[PDB]
Amino acid sequence: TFQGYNCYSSALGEYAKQKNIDQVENIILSQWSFFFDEEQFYKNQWYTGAADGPVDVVLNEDLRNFANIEVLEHISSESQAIDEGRKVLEKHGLQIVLMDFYYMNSFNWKSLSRFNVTREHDPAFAVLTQINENSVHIIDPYYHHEENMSMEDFIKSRNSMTKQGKISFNSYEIFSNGTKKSNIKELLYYRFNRYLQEKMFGKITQFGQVVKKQLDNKDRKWAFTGYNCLNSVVYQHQNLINLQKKFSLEMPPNLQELLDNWALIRKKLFEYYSRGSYNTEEISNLICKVASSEEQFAQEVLKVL
Numbered sequence: 347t348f349q350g351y352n353c354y355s356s357a358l359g360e361y362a363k364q365k366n367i368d369q370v371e372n373i374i375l376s377q378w379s380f381f382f383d384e385e386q387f388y389k390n391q392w393y394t395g396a397a398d399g400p401v402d403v404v405l406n407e408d409l410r411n412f413a414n415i416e417v418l419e420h421i422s423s424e425s426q427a428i429d430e431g432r433k434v435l436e437k438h439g440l441q442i443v444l445m446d447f448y449y450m451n452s453f454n455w456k457s458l459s460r461f462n463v464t465r466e467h468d469p470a471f472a473v474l475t476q477i478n479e480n481s482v483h484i485i486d487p488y489y490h491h492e493e494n495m496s497m498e499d500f501i502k503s504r505n506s507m508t509k510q511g512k513i514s515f516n517s518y519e520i521f522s523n524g525t526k527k528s529n530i531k532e533l534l535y536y537r538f539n540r541y542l543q544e545k546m547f548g549k550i551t552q553f554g555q556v557v558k559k560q561l562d563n564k565d566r567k568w569a570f571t572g573y574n575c576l577n578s579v580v581y582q583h584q585n586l587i588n589l590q591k592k593f594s595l596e597m598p599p600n601l602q603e604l605l606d607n608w609a610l611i612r613k614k615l616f617e618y619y620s621r622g623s624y625n626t627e628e629i630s631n632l633i634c635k636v637a638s639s640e641e642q643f644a645q646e647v648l649k650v651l
């Protein structure tokens with residue numbers, strides 16, 4: 347399945363790939379973003395990484411602004427959701443749905459030695475491919491997993507209260523109003539220019555300073571949340587490496603090194619959470635160092651691209 351850089355972008359891109367909808371994948375693969383929300387940090391919601399969620403509104407703006415592609419949110423009800431689903435499958439073949447990940451658990455945490463897989467009501471995305479009498483078929487494109495789910499579990503998952511709001515059978519419809527094609531260099535220039543002008547590297551520094559202040563926080567789950575949140579940043583870095591390879595782009599020479607720096611930050615957050623270490627000072631230092639490295643990298647991308 348199409349990885350994207352977050353659950354929402356993975357779902358849009360998987361839909362786009364299966365239905366050869368032009369430009370959606372390229373606009374996702376060329377995204378360059380960082381956010382930090384101190385209020386979400388202290389409510390242990392998804393507080394950093396590529397984009398606020400679960401819907402990536404900045405990506406929606408990019409799709410409209412560059413390709414004249416709209417993403418329309420539909421809201422439904424218990425009585426109407428499945429019949430509306432059948433009509434969507436007849437007309438478009440797929441439906442992108444908001445789902446409580448509590449009912450999906452698409453990722454094998456035991457592969458990374460985490461056996462205490464704490465259950466959480468978190469909104470995620472699935473691509474619905476088939477409606478049966480007592481079951482549906484879904485793809486979780488972010489975790490490259492597909493399953494048959496009972497009709498009961500499907501309906502429950504689409505109607506549950508999560509830590510990040512109330513799901514009411516929400517579905518996302520991508521429609522092109524007249525697609526403008528972009529060169530990958532144009533899409534990257536706009537993103538890197540926006541990254542610098544909005545001082546997104548500054549939000550990395552803020553994250554670093556907040557990590558330093560958790561020295562004596564007895565609660566460590568911010569570090570697991572941070573670990574999960576930063577997978578989006580690793581994916582954007584890998585996506586840009588893949589774009590560099592495909593289109594023979596000129597990049598500053600330290601792109602792989604930056605990906606490695608984010609992978610190390612993630613490793614140390616995971617080790618801290620798992621009581622492997624006691625090193626918030628070290629983690630905060632690495633975050634503040636990568637903030638400056640990312641600012642410098644972005645300035646150099648605008649020069650050499």
Ligand SMILES: *C(=O)c1ccc(O)cc1
Nearest residue numbers: 353354447468469470471
């Ligand atoms: C994507 O939306 C998503 C949600 C929740 C988890 O845990 C992982 C991925």
